[PDB]
């Protein structure tokens, strides 16, 4: 499940104001139990993808604490 949403996650999600986003990622979410596939609900791509170290290698680059921009 973490990995179909981090699909839709890193390749649909760019261009979506927020709150379409998150009517985008529910729906996805409804229609994964809807086919029936074990997907949780708060799942962040950062907890599974984006380490401590190159996040603070990052965040001393130049930038904010937004979680739209990380």
Same mark, same amino acid.
Do not use: Q
């Given at each position: $499940?973490?990995?179909?949403?981090?699909?839709?996650?890193?390749?649909?999600?760019?261009?979506?104001?927020?709150?379409?986003? $998150?009517?985008?990622?529910?729906?996805?979410?409804?229609?994964?139990?809807?086919?029936?596939?074990?997907?949780?609900?708060?799942?962040?791509?950062?907890? *599974?993808?984006?380490?401590?170290?190159?996040?603070?290698?990052?965040?001393?680059? $130049?930038?904010?604490?937004?979680? *739209?921009?990380?």
């Amino acid at each position: $499940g973490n990995c179909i949403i981090s699909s839709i996650y890193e390749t649909y999600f760019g261009h979506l104001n927020e709150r379409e986003r $998150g009517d985008m990622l529910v729906i996805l979410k409804r229609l994964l139990g809807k086919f029936a596939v074990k997907y949780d609900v708060n799942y962040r791509f950062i907890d *599974y993808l984006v380490t401590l170290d190159e996040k603070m290698k990052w965040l001393e680059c $130049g930038l904010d604490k937004n979680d *739209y921009f990380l």
